[PDB]
């Protein structure tokens, strides 16, 4: 809230194209996902490898982020450069709950995306 009021860009991208909505969906922080989406974050933003904030939620098994991202405009059919859809990933790591929700919204038809992290410590 303090950062966004200052004028911080909501859709800032890292070297590989990850937005703060990508990171919040990846780490299972649904309250910040709602906060970012309330402040005009791109729900269908893609990284350089074509991963949506919905592929991160499905890859990490966060079913409630999957629900909240779908209800805010996430596409269950956009594919990544690796050739995976947010559901195929759910089936690949065997997340039954994420597969069940993404199965309803996804029509008929081995790389893991990880946001960069800071390893600094004193």
């Amino acid at each position: 809230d303090v950062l966004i009021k200052h004028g911080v860009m909501v859709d800032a991208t890292t070297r590989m194209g990850y937005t703060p909505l990508h990171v919040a969906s990846h780490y299972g922080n649904i309250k910040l996902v709602k906060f970012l989406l309330q402040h005009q974050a791109d729900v269908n933003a893609k990284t350089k490898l074509g991963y949506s904030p919905l592929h991160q939620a499905a890859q990490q098994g966060h079913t409630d982020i999957v629900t909240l991202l779908l209800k805010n405009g996430a596409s269950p059919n956009e594919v990544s450069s690796d050739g995976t859809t947010p559901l195929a990933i759910a089936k690949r790591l065997g997340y039954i709950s994420v597969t069940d929700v993404l199965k309803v919204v996804t029509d008929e038809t081995h790389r893991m995306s990880f946001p960069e992290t800071v390893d600094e410590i004193l």
């Binding site: 629900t67 779908l70 209800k71 805010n72 405009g73 929700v101 309803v104 919204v105």
Partner: protein, 45 residues
């Protein structure tokens, strides 16, 4: 207001089954696509 909006979406995807004189257990299976599409409509915006 958010709770009311969620409840409006809940009612929009609710399937009302009116009374009928002949329960066939097969015409009830004709509403499988209806329930599937109503769930896609709740799980989607």
């Amino acid at each position: 207001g958010e709770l009311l909006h969620s409840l409006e979406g809940f009612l929009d995807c609710s399937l009302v089954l009116p009374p009928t004189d002949a329960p066939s257990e097969q015409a009830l299976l004709s509403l499988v696509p209806v329930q599937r599409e109503l769930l896609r409509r709740r799980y989607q915006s």
